[PDB]
Amino acid sequence: ATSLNTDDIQGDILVGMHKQKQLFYFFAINDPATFKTFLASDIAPVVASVTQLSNVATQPLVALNIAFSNTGLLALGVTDNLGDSLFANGQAKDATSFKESTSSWVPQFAGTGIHGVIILASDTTDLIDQQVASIESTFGSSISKLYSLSASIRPGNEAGHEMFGFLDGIAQPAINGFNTPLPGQNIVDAGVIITGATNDPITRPSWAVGGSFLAFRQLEQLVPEFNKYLLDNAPAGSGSLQARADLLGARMVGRWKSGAPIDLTPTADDPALGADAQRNNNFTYSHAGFDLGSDQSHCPFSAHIRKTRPRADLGGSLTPPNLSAGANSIMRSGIPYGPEVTSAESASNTTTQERGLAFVAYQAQLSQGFHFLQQTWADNANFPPGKTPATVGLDPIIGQNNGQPRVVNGLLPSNSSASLSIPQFVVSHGGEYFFSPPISAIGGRLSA
């Protein structure tokens, strides 16, 4: 029965940092003894909890979370089995089953040299900067910075949008009964996200109960190229070029840039819908009487959000809310990075400055969350199953095919069998798998 201790869970996992800027600070541990000393004295009491972060009046000036790799845990003398072999083997090893070469990876990600990540969030970079100083002064050479990624909410009216322009963070699983569910939102057991929580089938070490597996990915987005492809391949029609291009963009994502799901508004954006959390997730893909297996006029089968949360595609209720595939939910805590598109990139339709998403997913089993979604669903041209045509193609957004163009069907409303071959517009530079421990562990077992 008994519910989540939110005083002991790190905030990013369930609520997110709530800050304009974030820094991911990837480190190695040089001397364990010293390191544990400050881990306990200086990190642990300032680590931000879910309880802390969901009180308007209790937000720290700088929000800090911390998570450790397998090689990080080992370095701290912590040889316990966390019960995740994807976690133990590391993301570099997992790269092939993603149909991606580590040739474009951050060199520091393409191994197991990284022992952890500190996440710092704040509403300005100055505060982040000074907090880094203060951490580096305290820890001294008991730690090395191996790599860093700065990120922020996008500027102006683009706030809450990702670099392609699309409102993100509409959709997350509701944890029963932490969250009171919205219309259409999936509801899952806590133990889908929190290791050792309600109905996590996997044995954990006791110190790790209340943590989560953080899957990090630095995903470069080629925004000019994406926009040009949309203009170049927009379906014919009586609509303006710009409307038809936007239509193709939305059909790839499954939502208009305003966030309005195309399933409910298949022919034009509806920003009032997009802004309304009571409506903007309230759908299953079913419609009377179109049949689920062949109708792509509301939303392609290949659309990103359909590919990553299949809803009524994997059975269950046709009226919301659909609760299929609960065990395959991830909490998403990602945030854009890099500069806005510049005038010169827009003009040449060519990227020169690296920008994209610092993609963060939480889950209790890596094998059921990020990794599953990416390989079994996104990368699988027969997914969802039992469609006609059977060849859905790949996720136009994250689908991978060894750096070759992805074939994706369903996108063009006038002919669902019509294929487009789509260059990659998202380019993984790698990341790593971390374990974000309960806060008690941090000054407890890990520092002890």
Ligand X SMILES: *[C@@H]1O[C@H](CO)[C@@H](O)[C@H](O)[C@H]1NC(C)=O
Ligand Y SMILES: *[C@@H]1O[C@H](CO)[C@@H](O[C@@H]2O[C@H](CO)[C@@H](O[C@@H]3O[C@H](CO)[C@@H](O)[C@H](O)[C@@H]3O)[C@H](O)[C@H]2NC(C)=O)[C@H](O)[C@H]1NC(C)=O
Active-site pick, 94, 168, 269, 270? 168
Nearer to ligand Y (CB atom), residue 94 or residue 263:
263
* Cα(175)–Cα(215) distance, integer angstroms: 19
For ligand HEM, the closer CB: 73 or 378: 378
Tell me if 80 contacts ligand X by CB under 6 A: no
417 binds ligand X, rule: CB under 6 A: yes
Give yes or no for residue 315 binding ligand Y (CB under 6 A). Answer: no
Cβ-based neighbours of 141, under 8 Å, separated by 6 or more: 30, 31
Residues in 171-190 that interact with ligand Y by CB under 6 A: 183
If one asks whether residue 5 binds ligand X (CB under 6 A), the answer comes out as no
Q: Which does 221 bind (CB under 5 to 8 A by kind): ligand HEM, ligand X, ligand Y, none?
A: ligand HEM
Q: Is 320 in the site for ligand Y (CB under 6 A)?
A: yes
Q: Which of 24, 285 has the CB closer to ligand Y?
A: 285
Of 4-12, 83-91, 133-141, 413-421, the segment contacting ligand X by CB under 6 A is 413-421
For residue 286, give every residue at least 6 positions away whose Cβ sits within 8 Å of its Cβ, in sequence order, or none.
292, 312, 318, 319
User: Phi then psi for 21, rounded to 5 degrees?
Assistant: -125, 145
Per CB under 6 A, 348 contacts ligand X: yes
Tokens standing for 134? 């203060």
Query: Would residue 168 show up in a list of annotated catalytic residues for this protein?
Result: yes
Nearer to ligand X, 320 or 389 (CB): 389
Q: How far apart are the first and last CA of the chain?
A: 31
Strand, helix or coil for residue 420? strand
Q: How far is the CB of 319 from ligand Y (least distance, A)?
A: 4
Task: Tell which residue, 1, 261, 10, has the closest CA to residue 118.
Answer: 10
CB of 233 to ligand X, least distance (A): 10
Distances in Å between the alpha carbon of 52 and those of 49, 123, 172, 238? 5, 16, 20, 53
Which among ligand HEM, ligand X, ligand Y, none contacts residue 228 (Cβ within 5 to 8 A by kind)?
A: ligand X
Which does residue 151 bind out of ligand HEM, ligand X, ligand Y, none, counting CB within 5 to 8 angstroms by kind?
none
Contact 194, 4 (CB under 8 A): yes
CB crowding 307-327: b at 16 or more within 10 Å, else e: bbbbbbbbebeeebbbbbbbb
**Positions marked catalytic:** 168
